[PDB]
Design a protein around this nucleic acid. Structure first.
Ligand SMILES: N[C@@H](Cc1c[nH]c2ccccc12)C(=O)O
Ligand SMILES: N[C@@H](Cc1c[nH]c2ccccc12)C(=O)O
Ligand SMILES: [Mg+2]
Ligand SMILES: [Mg+2]
Ligand SMILES: [Mg+2]
Ligand SMILES: [Mg+2]
Ligand SMILES: [Mg+2]
Ligand SMILES: [Mg+2]
Ligand SMILES: [Mg+2]
Ligand SMILES: [Mg+2]
Ligand SMILES: [Mg+2]
Ligand SMILES: [Mg+2]
Ligand SMILES: [Mg+2]
Ligand SMILES: [Mg+2]
Ligand SMILES: [Mg+2]
Ligand SMILES: [Mg+2]
Ligand SMILES: [Mg+2]
Ligand SMILES: [Mg+2]
Ligand SMILES: [Mg+2]
Ligand SMILES: [Mg+2]
Ligand SMILES: [Mg+2]
Ligand SMILES: [Mg+2]
Ligand SMILES: [Mg+2]
Ligand SMILES: [Mg+2]
Ligand SMILES: [Mg+2]
Ligand SMILES: [Mg+2]
Ligand SMILES: [Mg+2]
Ligand SMILES: [Mg+2]
Ligand SMILES: [Mg+2]
Ligand SMILES: [Mg+2]
Ligand SMILES: [Mg+2]
Ligand SMILES: [Mg+2]
Ligand SMILES: [Mg+2]
Ligand SMILES: [Mg+2]
Ligand SMILES: [Mg+2]
Ligand SMILES: [Mg+2]
Ligand SMILES: [Mg+2]
Ligand SMILES: [Mg+2]
Ligand SMILES: [Mg+2]
Ligand SMILES: [Mg+2]
Ligand SMILES: [Mg+2]
Ligand SMILES: [Mg+2]
Ligand SMILES: [Mg+2]
Ligand SMILES: [Mg+2]
Ligand SMILES: [Mg+2]
Ligand SMILES: [Mg+2]
Ligand SMILES: [Mg+2]
Ligand SMILES: [Mg+2]
Ligand SMILES: [Mg+2]
Ligand SMILES: [Mg+2]
Ligand SMILES: [Mg+2]
Ligand SMILES: [Mg+2]
Ligand SMILES: [Mg+2]
Ligand SMILES: [Mg+2]
Ligand SMILES: [Mg+2]
Lengths: 46, 150, 20, 117
RNA sequence: CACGAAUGGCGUAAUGAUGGCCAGGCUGUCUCCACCCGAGACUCAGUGAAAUUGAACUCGCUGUGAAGAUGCAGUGUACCC
RNA sequence: CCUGCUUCCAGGAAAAGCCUCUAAGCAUCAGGUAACAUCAAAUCGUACCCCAAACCGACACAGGUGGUCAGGUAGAGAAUA
RNA sequence: GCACCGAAGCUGCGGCAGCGACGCUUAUGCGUUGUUGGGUAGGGGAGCGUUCUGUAAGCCUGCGAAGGUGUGCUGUGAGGCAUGCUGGAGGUAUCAGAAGUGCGAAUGCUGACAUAAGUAACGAUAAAGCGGGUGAAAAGCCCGCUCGCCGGAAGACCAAGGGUUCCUGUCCAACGUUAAUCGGGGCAGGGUGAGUCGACCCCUAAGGCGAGGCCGAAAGGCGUAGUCGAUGGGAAACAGGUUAA
RNA sequence: ACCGACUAAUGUUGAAAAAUUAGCGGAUGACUUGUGGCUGGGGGUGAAAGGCCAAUCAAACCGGGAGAUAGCUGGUUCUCCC
RNA sequence: GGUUAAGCGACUAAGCGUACACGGUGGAUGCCCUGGCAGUCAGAGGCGAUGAAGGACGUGCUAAUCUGCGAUAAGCGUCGGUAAGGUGAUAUGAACCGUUAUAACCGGCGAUUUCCGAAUGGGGAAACCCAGUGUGUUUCGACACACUAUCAUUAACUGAAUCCAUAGGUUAAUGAGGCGAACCGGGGGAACUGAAACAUCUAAGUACCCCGAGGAAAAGAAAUCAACCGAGAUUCCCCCAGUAGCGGCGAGCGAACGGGGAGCAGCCCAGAGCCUGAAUCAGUGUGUGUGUUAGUGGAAGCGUCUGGAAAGGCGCGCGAUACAGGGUGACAGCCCCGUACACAAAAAUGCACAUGCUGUGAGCUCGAUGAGUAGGGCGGGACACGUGGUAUCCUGUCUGAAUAUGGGGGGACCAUCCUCCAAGGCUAAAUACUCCUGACUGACCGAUAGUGAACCAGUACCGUGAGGGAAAGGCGAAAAGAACCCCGGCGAGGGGAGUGAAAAAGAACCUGAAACCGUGUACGUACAAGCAGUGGGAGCACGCUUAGGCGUGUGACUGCGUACCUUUUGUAUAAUGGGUCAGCGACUUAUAUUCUGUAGCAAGGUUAACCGAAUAGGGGAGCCGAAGGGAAACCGAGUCUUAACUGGGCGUU
């Protein structure tokens, strides 16, 4: 049957990508936390 | 401990023990039920009890003549070997040597002799009196101590 | 091994109501 | 001061398994099982130290009895004799003599019969 | 006992994988099950799981007993796998 | 062909490219039109799977996955053999 | 009515401990001696051992430390001492001092290993047979001849998504629910050629962002000019050949 | 074709965390479908079932207050003496 | 002796059990520590449009990854320092480079510094698409480079409705923007919970969101306290005291006066005249000193024994202002690196002073003295203080003075007295904190511990995402990491050989426990029924002993005999929990208070902070006790009760 993950990069980037993340005070805090955590992929982009 | 506060798995349903926080002392990594903190072990010791002890200590050092009091004690130059010899001649290895006013050379010698230390009159502490096999003390220091203890 | 993924359900499921 | 533990632990454990040597299966392999086996063995012993003195007395009394009957007299009468046989006291085990020295026994039976006359 | 008029009453052609009842046909649904063809089950070869599990040298009966006993009492039966 | 034609009500995107019109502006100029000649057209994608063993399903999983093409005999048929 | 059996009760022999008294003798301990010593909740008393500080520049230790495994002895016990083997570098009396100080249970936590068991199962009942190659080995790979199955697909081209799975050599440990010489598996090398296909690009829908601006305790909200956004509009190549790809 | 899910059997450590087979309903419409957009948690959306909002729903998920509180259940580790 | 008969009778083990021996599995224990943990003392407290934090892509003789670096790409220049060896790591090899000064390495200052990211020329699905304008070509097209965001301030030029004037528009100069551990001030601000329920109250102005700043922040120079004596800004510490008070007078909350300490500091504006740039502050250049960022010198041990190896034992010397520490084939003052100690800076810098330049005002005379404020009404909020008899403070709302003969406060309120001067500001120290730099310390951990991370870990993995988040350390002294031979499929794996102290240290490598699985031997086991042991007990095998019913192993037969925990009136229970092993896993810590023990001293005992020659000594602020009774005034070995006690209550030993 049709399951929950129906991949699509356009939507991926638009919803979770760097710039999207960057477009909101909290989206930025998202990055900030991940940087402080020393994460290797801030936001799974190209 | 470092982890989120998410419940690891459902209260009821899984065949599993209850489980609440992944930081639980019962669980593996992360725990310690009564983790210690930096702490202060300093005790009080009454004024009159401290003095009371020094007296019992001196008044026992004589009774084993481990206290040999002398008019003046000092070495002629800042050289350990000198002091080593004085002690040799005085028949001594392990010694406290409480000087009257304390001088440069007597201190720099003995800094490197291990079983021997040299203190001024105020520097007298209880463990040391007992620590060394013999306490020397100049007759000049004796009078200082005489009063310090009343 | 690599070998390390357990997503154990919920009981399993079917039946039971055991008269009330 | 953190305490390693666990060197003293296997000391305690092996101390028990050793006592379990000989027991069947888990009773001699598996501590948790052994510690029980080891205890109950102890329990029976403490009991059976008292039983031992019971079991042997009735062992003795059993064979005292046949020998008495063998010399034509029940155990009942026979102990009563020796009792009445001008005081005189003598263990029921020591009536050992019933197996190893049958004349001595018969001899004891007579002495007993006499008091009963 | 205890319908009732737009928390609608009474009717109604047509429609309904809607509820109840009947009949013809039909038949292995049944009387009552037989045979057959295929896939497993069985044997050999290869690979190789699972839940459960205080420990096991893990029988029947009548009785006892935290009151429904493989494990207690009594007794019957039973070569080992 | 057909974004046609007929008919009906529920009345059926936008903007640019394209054509034309001129304003400010340029009037020999510049531009505009045509013929011929010539030069430019960069950069990035291009393998392979794609109703599946290559994607979503933890698996070389009887499931889910939009578009395109469509032969013969019988047949109304993209049914069915 | 007299026997006798019968209990961890009574007695006898040896032993321990508390409280008594009496005698030996009092920084007490003996000898008697009378007596007391089931025990959950729980109160009191006394201890073993572990880690770490001092004592310790001492002491033990390559002529073998710790740990592991046996053995003997010893204590009322927690234990201790000794030593064989293993081990191959540390260990620490004594008296004090301080606690991450003792585990069988918590459907406790982590790891390892059992069990059922060499049992179920090996994923569509479209189906295989033989010959010949290769090979250590062929039911499964290669070639061939039959046989069977799909054929609005189980053929063919893509988008989306994947991201080297493509092709060629090489290997078969692990992956393949079996074997495997074979593979979408390992290793190495190769392979994607555009004015015209597509993206970029021009154009905008939904909608997003939004200089100023209006609004809001702060964060921010809405929106004009604009500026972005294809699922739609916008110039142009066809038939054939060739690469292992 | 495509979209549905009325019956049955199978399956229930499945081939499958919701399917297979045989039958069944709709099939020019309140139809069905690809791409993309908007709606956010006492809030959304709902031809209405408390349905759905990522295998989660009478208040989603992630982190935090946080060691919430638990007059309840469980467990609670060496020895000897009174 | 044969035949027959009756009686009794071992050796069997498909398999199983126990014991022991040798293994497998597995990774506990111990030993180890370039990793962690908690601190002390100092340094530093910021980075950023001169493009940060953080990334993408590159970069080598180089396929990957790490580090470094940026198309000048493990690097370039220069100044110092050092130098015999170097070209970062996994990581050999290649090709090189250097040895007395341009090898490398360390430090100071420079240079280069792709793309994304505040990202700033526009856009955008981050690391990409596209421009306007300027420049740029003895092959002056198209590409390459530079600049062009927004806001603020200032200036200039422009300039509507509207003529003036504004708004609007272009340019320009400056500054801002983003990131970052805590400490700090400010705007907002929960609920669980506690009250054994719950509204008031609590948790608590906490958690959290937000804004802002500094090296510290804030606070601060009395419209303050006191009580008729006096003190003299703010801040912090110890007292005062769990007192006075607040309080569904519940739960709880909880001061001040005064005292002892740390540190101490005071100034401007509300203004004009003269004199004028005179004090001072910051920004800045120089100088100097002093710290910093590389460095230099740095004492003294040999003999022998055991051993694979000496640092160990034993002997005899030697240095010590150096016996801190690390390393080296086992434990080294004298082998190495250091340590004490003494020295050193070409350059750049922190800090002090000294000045130069800029900006700034000093000084005397005479003035001035903070109104939509104080106060009030309404509503809230703050003060320990819940509206209470509630002073005081703040203000959303409506009001609204006096002005030195004036005004504030002294906890309702009034008088008198006393005391202070609101409605403008600045101000150092004692105080807080540690992303980070340096050095040092620990009755802190030692691989299930300690950071989640001793390891290429915020990784692999899981999730659309926020976000969650592992496992995994040890051959040896030295790789001397096993040439060569044999079985095998030019396999896997193994046996020899060889290295080594050890190969039983062989890389699946120190130690190598336990569950669990085998091979070997002894004994038992195929007529027997159950917690599997225990008391008895033959036989067998083995040792003994000189026998002597003895040790060890097994255990026919036999008496008795229903595991453990928990929970219960009571459990074999067919009631709970446990498949097994190993490791971990639960009464702690701080501060108050009271009792016991013990110690000191004694009608006295003891200090807190703080000073400090730093466990001493100083400091008696203070706390407890020596007197009680009464609500209290007050009285006092008594006092309270009452007019008063023959009394009575609490006290006097
Ligand atoms: N059979 C289930 C009981 C059950 C009934 N309904 C369910 C729904 C979901 C999960 C479990 C169940 C069990 O073993 O416990
Ligand atoms: N109780 C019924 C039906 C049932 C099955 N599963 C259930 C789960 C929940 C409630 C009911 C059920 C039965 O067991 O036969
Ligand atoms: Mg939580
Ligand atoms: Mg921890
Ligand atoms: Mg003191
Ligand atoms: Mg008896
Ligand atoms: Mg109604
Ligand atoms: Mg219908
Ligand atoms: Mg088989
Ligand atoms: Mg029965
Ligand atoms: Mg192609
Ligand atoms: Mg397959
Ligand atoms: Mg599939
Ligand atoms: Mg068909
Ligand atoms: Mg008892
Ligand atoms: Mg130890
Ligand atoms: Mg355990
Ligand atoms: Mg227990
Ligand atoms: Mg379980
Ligand atoms: Mg079976
Ligand atoms: Mg079967
Ligand atoms: Mg089968
Ligand atoms: Mg691949
Ligand atoms: Mg291929
Ligand atoms: Mg295989
Ligand atoms: Mg491949
Ligand atoms: Mg557009
Ligand atoms: Mg704006
Ligand atoms: Mg908007
Ligand atoms: Mg398109
Ligand atoms: Mg139809
Ligand atoms: Mg759902
Ligand atoms: Mg809790
Ligand atoms: Mg709380
Ligand atoms: Mg056999
Ligand atoms: Mg055996
Ligand atoms: Mg840009
Ligand atoms: Mg931009
Ligand atoms: Mg409550
Ligand atoms: Mg005065
Ligand atoms: Mg040097
Ligand atoms: Mg030296
Ligand atoms: Mg004033
Ligand atoms: Mg201020
Ligand atoms: Mg760890
Ligand atoms: Mg270990
Ligand atoms: Mg090993
Ligand atoms: Mg038999
Ligand atoms: Mg049986
Ligand atoms: Mg029986
Ligand atoms: Mg009950
Ligand atoms: Mg009870
Ligand atoms: Mg019982
Ligand atoms: Mg049972
Ligand atoms: Mg039970």
């Amino acid at each position: 049957m049709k399951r929950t993950f129906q991949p699509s990069v356009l939507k991926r980037n638009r919803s979770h990508g760097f710039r999207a993340r960057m477009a909101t005070k909290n989206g930025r805090q998202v990055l900030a936390r991940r940087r402080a955590k020393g994460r290797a992929r801030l936001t799974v982009s190209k | 401990v470092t982890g989120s506060g998410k419940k690891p798995w459902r209260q009821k349903g899984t065949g599993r023990a209850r489980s609440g926080s992944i930081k639980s002392p019962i669980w593996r990594s992360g725990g310690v039920t009564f983790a210690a903190r930096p702490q202060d072990h300093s005790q009080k010791v009454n004024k009159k009890m401290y003095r009371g002890a020094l007296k019992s200590i001196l008044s026992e050092l004589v009774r084993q003549d481990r206290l040999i009091v002398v008019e003046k004690f000092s070495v002629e130059a800042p050289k350990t070997k000198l002091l080593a010899q004085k002690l040799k001649d005085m028949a001594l290895e392990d010694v406290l040597i409480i000087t009257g006013e304390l001088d440069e050379n007597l201190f720099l010698a003995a800094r490197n002799l291990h079983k021997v230390d040299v203190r001024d009159a105020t520097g007298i502490d209880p463990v040391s009196l007992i620590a060394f096999d013999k306490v020397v003390m100049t007759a000049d220091a004796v009078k200082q101590v005489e009063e310090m203890l009343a | 091994h690599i070998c390390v993924t357990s997503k154990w359900f919920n009981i399993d499921n079917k039946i039971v109501d055991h008269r009330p | 001061a953190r305490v390693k533990r666990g060197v003293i632990a296997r000391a305690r454990h092996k101390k028990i398994l050793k006592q379990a040597k000989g027991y069947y299966g888990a009773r001699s392999r598996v501590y948790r099982v052994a510690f029980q086996a080891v205890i109950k063995a102890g329990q029976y012993a403490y009991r059976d130290r008292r039983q031992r003195k019971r079991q042997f007395r009735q062992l003795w009394i059993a064979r005292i009895n046949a020998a008495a009957r063998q010399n034509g007299i029940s155990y009942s009468k026979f102990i009563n004799g020796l009792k009445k046989a001008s005081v005189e006291i003598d263990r029921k085990i020591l009536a050992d003599i019933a197996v190893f020295d049958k004349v001595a026994f018969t001899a004891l039976v007579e002495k007993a019969k006499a008091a009963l006359a």
